[PDB]
């Protein structure tokens, strides 16, 4: 199928507590592979997956160089943002950036991303045509204006549709054994009496990769949608993911319910019944 590469950054100003902390991370699909931490001692982009550990010293030099430049850039954008919002130079703020690309199952560009959030809400983002910007507010309109006069977007297009896809393609090869795997969910059901007349059925999905999954409960074939408790898909810590879905059921009606598991590692969706 398709694949993605994502870089995520966070810069957190620390007034009355230091100088702005910058953390960047790289993902391919749902597998992290580099980090950078401005407070860590190394001051180096480091490997986080086994399959990236096979790049030359000059990859690491170069990737360290770029991330460090980004950290100085968002350091200064933090200052500019304080201005644009007329905010005190004494409070802590958050500049978050994401960028990267998707590719289709043959390797071709699908989509490029470049976007910014300030204090957790949208700031400015590159629209899909890689040609225009979507600004969240008046403050981000100053930026949109600056960046259109300057043709910032056209100049990102070399990276988005070239470097980004090419690196993604090179990662999917050197990481084939781990990044083109599809690990289907190990499923089971639990069942706990809650009262004289009520029971919890919980549908478990374990050990799957990639993270995307869907679990829905039916009652006699009808989607049960509000009696259902659903957890955020979580990481096991070994590179796979977990999730569960639970319904509270009247005692003795357990057979009436079924749980349905769709994951791209499953030929046919699984239906589970206590």
């Amino acid at each position: 199928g398709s694949h993605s590469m994502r870089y995520f950054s966070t810069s957190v100003s620390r007034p009355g507590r230091g100088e702005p902390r910058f953390i960047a991370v790289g993902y391919v699909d749902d597998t992290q592979f580099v980090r950078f931490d401005s407070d860590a001692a190394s001051q180096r982009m480091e490997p986080r997956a086994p399959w990236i550990e096979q790049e030359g010293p000059e990859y690491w030099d170069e990737e360290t160089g770029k991330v460090k430049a980004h950290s100085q850039t968002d350091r200064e954008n933090l200052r500019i943002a304080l201005r644009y919002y007329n905010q005190s130079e004494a409070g802590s703020h958050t500049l978050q950036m994401m960028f990267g690309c998707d590719v289709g199952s043959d390797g071709r560009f699908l989509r490029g991303y470049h976007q910014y959030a300030y204090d957790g809400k949208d700031y400015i983002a590159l629209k899909e045509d890689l040609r225009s910007w979507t600004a969240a507010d008046m403050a981000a309109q100053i930026t949109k204006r600056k960046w259109e006069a300057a043709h910032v977007a056209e100049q990102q297009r070399a990276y988005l549709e070239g470097t980004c896809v090419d690196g993604l393609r090179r990662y999917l090869e050197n990481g084939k054994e781990t990044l083109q795997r599809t690990d289907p969910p190990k499923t089971h059901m639990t069942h706990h009496p809650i009262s004289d007349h009520e029971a919890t059925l919980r549908c478990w999905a374990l050990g799957f990769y990639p993270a995307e999954i869907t679990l829905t409960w039916q009652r006699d074939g009808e989607d049960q949608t509000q009696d259902t408790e659903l957890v955020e898909t979580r990481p096991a810590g070994d590179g796979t993911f977990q999730k569960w879905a639970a319904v509270v059921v009247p005692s003795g009606e357990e057979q009436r319910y079924t749980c349905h598991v769709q994951h791209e590692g499953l030929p046919k969706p699984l239906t589970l019944r206590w």
Partner: peptide
């Protein structure tokens, strides 16, 4: 591969 990002708000 990271980007070379220098554009200011």
């Amino acid at each position: 591969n990271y980007d070379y990002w220098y554009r200011l708000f």
